[PDB]
Amino acid sequence: DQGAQIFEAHCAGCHLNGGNIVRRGKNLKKRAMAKNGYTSVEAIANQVTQGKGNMSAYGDKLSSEEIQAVSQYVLQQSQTDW
């Protein structure tokens, strides 16, 4: 539940319903996530913490516990397709 709330507050601006309005080829749905190896909590949490390209780093914005919770939410949603 907390993971979904964090996602709504911090991630849905760019990734609503698992999309990516900024970088077409890097969404949160099964195909792109599997291709890029975002298939574990740790893989996702590392990317969220440090940022990448035009995506900001969240390591100074969200706590480690919040990053874990949102990463689990994204993993579950991706694996089951949003």
As annotated, the binding site for heme c includes: 11, 14-15, 23, 26, 55
Contact at 8 Å (CB) between 15 and 45? no
Q: How far is CA 35 from CA 3, 7, 26, 27, 60, in A?
A: 23, 22, 10, 11, 28
Among 56, 59, 72, 82, interactor with Cl ion by CB under 5 A: 56
54 Ramachandran zone, left/alpha/beta (phi>0; psi -120 to 50): alpha
Instruction: Please say which residue, 60 or 80, places its beta carbon nearer to Na ion.
Output: 60
State which of residues 5, 8, 17, 23 lies at the interface with ligand HEC (CB under 6 A): 23
> In angstroms, what is the minimal distance from the CB of 19 to ligand HEC?
10
List of residues contacting Na ion (CB under 5 A): 5, 8, 60
